[PDB]
Enzyme design. Sequence first.
Site, short mmCIF file in Angstrom:
data_model
loop_
_atom_site.label_atom_id
_atom_site.label_comp_id
_atom_site.label_asym_id
_atom_site.label_seq_id
_atom_site.Cartn_x
_atom_site.Cartn_y
_atom_site.Cartn_z
N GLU A 35 0.19 -7.43 9.33
CA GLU A 35 -0.08 -6.07 8.82
C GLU A 35 0.93 -5.69 7.73
O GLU A 35 0.51 -5.14 6.69
CB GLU A 35 -0.03 -5.03 9.93
N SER A 50 -8.54 6.76 3.04
CA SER A 50 -7.46 6.84 4.05
C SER A 50 -6.33 5.90 3.58
O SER A 50 -6.58 5.11 2.70
CB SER A 50 -7.96 6.44 5.41
N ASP A 52 -3.09 3.26 5.29
CA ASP A 52 -2.42 2.60 6.43
C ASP A 52 -0.91 2.70 6.21
O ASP A 52 -0.44 2.49 5.04
CB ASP A 52 -2.81 1.14 6.51
#
Length: 129
Positions: A35, A50, A52
């Site tokens: 990630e 959006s 992250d």
Amino acid sequence: KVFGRCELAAAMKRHGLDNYRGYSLGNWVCAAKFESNFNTQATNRNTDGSTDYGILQINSRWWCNDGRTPGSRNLCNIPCSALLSSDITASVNCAKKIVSDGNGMNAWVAWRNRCKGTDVQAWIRGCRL
Ligand SMILES: [Pt+2]
Ligand SMILES: [Pt+2]
Ligand SMILES: [Pt+2]
């Protein structure tokens, strides 16, 4: 903060992620690697508008407020900036809510595509846990 592998293992352990909802520490360390590359400051803007945020790339549609994600919820009741801190407490508390929501660690598509079913114990090798 860019964490070392064993450093992040220890922090995740102190904050109650080892075997949380059944997921061994190595699963959490593998997820964080793919990630964020262990960088608490990582941000990634999605085509849906959006973003992250942080070590586990937690998304603003459902989990945190960034003031610019339309029709979003804030189910972790935090500002998304809380997720970029050198202190991982807010990200870990959020990660517990996410992993509890019914799909377990499949909520992290990088975990499903790169960590699930692999030898994830390799990610905690050497670490004093
Ligand atoms: Pt810590
Ligand atoms: Pt904690
Ligand atoms: Pt590595």
